[PDB]
Amino acid sequence: GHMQEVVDGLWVGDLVAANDDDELEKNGIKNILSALRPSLKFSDKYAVYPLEIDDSADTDLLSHLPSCVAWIKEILDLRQKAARSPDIDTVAQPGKPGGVLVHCQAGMSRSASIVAAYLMSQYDLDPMEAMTMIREKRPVVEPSATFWHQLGLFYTTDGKVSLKDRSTRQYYMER
């Protein structure tokens, strides 16, 4: 498939998956975390978090990870009750009661890194443990080198991006 379910209600996938409304409906997905530039035009059937970032060696994903993690938590909590967090960027639409697909163009780097950050925060995993958990469902995932580094910074600071950490401050200084 073009998307795979990592844990209950949380999917990672590619550009094909984001456009396949049949598969999204069949799996009860009503939220899309869309990590792509330019942003796509989605139907209002979905709540969408447009993350306008590239998959480049100088892309800053770290600054957005607390917002991404909090948005996924907002959705999955709401989905369970059906059966705002100050961390969430205001461009993220209010979560709807259903699953969430996190996607980029290929479903390997931006999207897998965002899902890994969520798994690190939710299950107290380190980046490798998180990424292995995803890879066992979607074997092609492979963060870029800079995303692996940024996941390490996110791990160190317990998911609050703090520049009291030397390495995090250094990352932002070099940018």
Which of 17, 18, 69, 104 is close enough to bind ligand VO4 by CB under 6 A? Answer: 104
Number of residues counted as binding ligand VO4 (CB under 6 A): 8
For the chain, give the secondary structure using H, E and C.
Answer: CCEEEEECCEEEECHHHHHCHHHHHHCCEEEEEEECCCCCCCCCCCEEEEECCCCCCCCCCHHHHHHHHHHHHHHHHHHHHHCCCCCCCCCCCCCCCCEEEEECCCCCCHHHHHHHHHHHHHHCCCHHHHHHHHHCCCCCCCCCHHHHHHHHHHHHCCCCCCCCCHHHHHHHHHC
Q: For the CB of residue 169, give the shortest distance to ligand VO4 in the complex, in Å.
A: 25
Taking CB under 6 A as the binding criterion, the range among 2-10, 90-98, 108-116, 155-163 that sits at the site for ligand VO4 is 108-116
Taking CB under 6 A as the binding criterion, the range among 26-34, 61-69, 89-97, 102-110 that sits at the site for ligand VO4 is 102-110
Taking CB under 6 A as the binding criterion, the range among 19-27, 101-109, 115-123, 150-158 that sits at the site for ligand VO4 is 101-109
Q: For the CB of residue 11, give the shortest distance to ligand VO4 in the complex, in Å.
A: 14
Does the footprint of ligand VO4 cover residue 79 (CB under 6 A)? no
Q: For the CB of residue 18, give the shortest distance to ligand VO4 in the complex, in Å.
A: 11
Q: For the CB of residue 174, give the shortest distance to ligand VO4 in the complex, in Å.
A: 21
